[PDB]
Design a protein around this ligand. Structure first.
Ligand SMILES: Cc1nc2c(N)ncnc2n1CCO
Ligand SMILES: Cc1nc2c(N)ncnc2n1CCO
Ligand SMILES: Cc1nc2c(N)ncnc2n1CCO
Ligand SMILES: Cc1nc2c(N)ncnc2n1CCO
Lengths: 261, 261, 261, 261
């Protein structure tokens, strides 16, 4: 079927791309980077992240695959030596697909803007103090003061979420996790401190107290939004689909990345 | 139908119990503490915990209710002033039921012993050093050295799990969370550090490295087990059933307990 | 002697200032905000912080006093009701002085710039990834990757240092404490994680690995420095001098601010 | 002069001991394990710890040296290959001595008992809940509820203190650090959470609220004390003296143990 391949841009990732394309030339596979059904990422998890956001409007028609030319990644989790076996099983098809949950972020102004995140979305101040009221399912939960907040996907829990003390969630759990950044807790300002894991259909909204300008990141895209009235987090109805050609368990992927390999 | 009421044992909880029983006497309600369908706990979350383990072999035939004579609890979450309205709606029936996940703990010896936990199960050393190999789904994940480990239910995340840095999970998520106690991480011993959230059907097993004696707790029951070969954690197939007479959201219950009320 | 008074600028702090000045008019006290020997801060700890940096070149000739028109502060630690008793004991003199350690920050370019910090100095990235080599006493200690680093004074440990997990140090200890911000620790990048407390004459230097641009803060002053070659931290030879008119222990000040008052 | 050598008891540590003794036989050195002036520990930090407590009543007449037959230790910080160069410089004398601060622990009953700690002293419950009032310099600081408390020496900060989130202090700082174990913080029970670093002459006392029985550890000695009325912590007037034959900085020792070697 139709396929395309992105590359980190360095020498080793470009040459591995040209080899798979040539290998794909020996099968009924059409290269099409406009309406592809297979998207192969060669490089790292960041290269995978860019491939995800390049085709985030066609998520239900694509099965992603990641190849890591460097260290092992949680998304680019196949060694370059498996490329020739990869193009082989990709051309036959009949493979199985695995789906991971995504995070929807809505930004309301004085107008709206929606985004999808494969890892996490963070909110910080535009320079001054960061103060937001945290509203869970329309119930005011807390007034947060500190550096910022981070809402992570399940598979995103191994990224920025881990550095903030968040838990690692298996990606089969449809949920989202909220962690704090350098919260100030004293006699008069109190946060929950613990990370919070929210299930599907739970809406977490951040509302400004004074400053209405926040530096909002979604994966590696960080944009200063101005005159913000609300930031809404919830598990997305959309899922990212992976092509599965063998068994590489998430917990094993966690072990290899943080314990030793 | 059949019902029973447990009490913390102090004066205020005993008198509230006798009042509900007398109120129940005005309805078609038979007091039966052998095969009850309604179990009312009056006191605190600990009183609720004892009521749970008193009838853990009849979990599918019972809807639990907790009344807090002291501070608000996550299980005993109804004020004593709601007792007369409680006995009223309990007698009519037609109420809705809410189910929370439970944790199964299996202990293997040189023989087996199984337990159910409403909050958490912890493992510690019998005095010496605590060292276990952590095996997730038959894959060796890590060798843990430290004070001990804690596997928490979703609703149990607000108890001991919270004190160890674990996240707070909404109890509609069928999962279990593993946290570390004072892990030693250096050049040669490394743990994941982050809490781990496991979905249904994921089996986490602890295996001894040297000492085969561990102090194992299950909720408030702590027993020294000897000649242990394995400790297996997994989400239980059984669930605890609550009677729901109005709306008291979990996140609201979290706010009232840790932010302010 | 010579004195001056700064104010937060709001109504209550301005009027308390005019009252103390009028009270000072009944004594041999000359108002001089150019070469003062007494500097009174009325407002909050931030107002005190501005008063410190306004006269940081005359630190050895000044005894500072802070009055809090709002909540209790660690520097502005005297209630407005003590103002008339304050001006009284300040005019007589013969009071005792207390000294707190300060932090010296040196920035080297491709040129040098030095600063003094009463609370802390932080280093972060100019947008991209923050990576620095940490060199303690000319010995390379670690390569830090994460959000940033914070070096705190003893009295500054109750501010940003506390939010990052740092310890609270009694200000009679001449030392400085370094804490991490959202460090990434995996198989290939490892930080110490624990906060580090350095004594006098220990030099901690940060050196760039790739990006030479860092957003450096010193108390509430945050400046983007460009083409940076080194950042040097060490306990300053200078100390801030407080006027002591009664006993308000630091640990008591910690209790009142974080436990309850 | 007079000297003695302790050994871990395994084969490699025993043989290295007999070699140094034979090497000492070529010098004016008398083996005396009753009134030694040199105490050499061969094994690990635990072997060093036992050597410290074996001669804790003669601390001012002894210069300790540690040799690690296994991994590098913070006290046993000299490789076995340096033994022949060690016995050489030890016999000549004229070496320099380095002193580290120690922690004094006093236990009051309904009678008193005092102890010295090279690493730390911990207090925990005898099975039930651990609740103590924390009194700093006769001022009630907090009511602690949780697993227990740990007061660490400067050099002890790299041991149990590190696992609890405490900071690493350079041992030239005469101070002690208090850390919390799994504290419960909610609406009604609040602890400081942050570790606390106390200077010389600051007295930290723990007082029972209900249970008067506590499991108290001092380094590796753990004893159940009964009918306890008070536990007093303070920096000891005594110091441990090390023989210094070259330069092995503490921060370098920290790097080798936790970063990589
Ligand atoms: C892009 C990315 N996604 C990640 C993830 N889900 N878990 C761990 N690491 C990750 N990275 C590398 C930058 O943090
Ligand atoms: C018995 C109990 N269960 C709890 C829970 N699930 N969350 C918070 N607190 C709890 N308690 C009180 C003792 O910790
Ligand atoms: C200006 C300031 N200094 C502080 C300090 N040393 N400890 C706690 N709080 C402090 N504040 C208030 C802003 O954090
Ligand atoms: C006996 C000992 N003392 C230590 C110390 N001061 N720092 C790190 N590790 C240490 N050990 C080994 C057991 O934790």
């Amino acid at each position: 079927m139709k396929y395309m391949i992105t590359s980190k841009g360095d020498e080793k990732s470009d040459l591995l791309r040209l080899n798979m394309i040539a290998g794909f030339g020996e099968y009924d596979m059409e290269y099409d980077d406009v309406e592809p059904e297979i998207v192969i990422s060669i490089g790292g998890d960041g290269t995978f992240l860019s491939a995800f956001h390049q085709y985030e409007e066609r998520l239900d028609e694509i099965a992603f695959i990641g190849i890591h030319t460097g260290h092992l990644g949680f998304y680019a989790d196949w060694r370059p030596a498996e490329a020739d076996k990869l193009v082989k099983l990709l051309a036959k098809g009949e493979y199985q697909k695995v789906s991971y949950p995504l995070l929807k972020t809505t930004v309301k102004y004085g107008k709206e803007a929606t985004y999808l995140a494969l890892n996490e979305s963070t909110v910080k101040s535009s320079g001054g103090p960061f103060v937001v009221d945290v509203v869970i399912n329309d119930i005011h939960f807390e007034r947060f003061r500190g550096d910022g907040l981070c809402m992570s996907t399940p598979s995103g829990t191994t990224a920025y979420n881990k550095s903030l003390g968040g838990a690692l969630m298996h990606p089969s759990i449809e949920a989202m996790q909220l962690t704090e950044m350098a919260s100030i807790n004293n006699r008069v300002y109190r946060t929950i401190g613990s990370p919070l894991v929210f299930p599907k259909h739970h809406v977490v909204s951040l509302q400004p107290v004074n400053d209405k300008d926040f530096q909002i990141s979604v994966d590696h895209l960080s944009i200063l939004h101005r005159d913000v009235q609300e930031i809404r987090y919830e598990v997305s109805a959309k899922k990212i689909h992976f092509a599965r050609f063998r068994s590489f368990p998430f917990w094993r992927r966690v072990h290899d990345s943080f314990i030793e390999d």
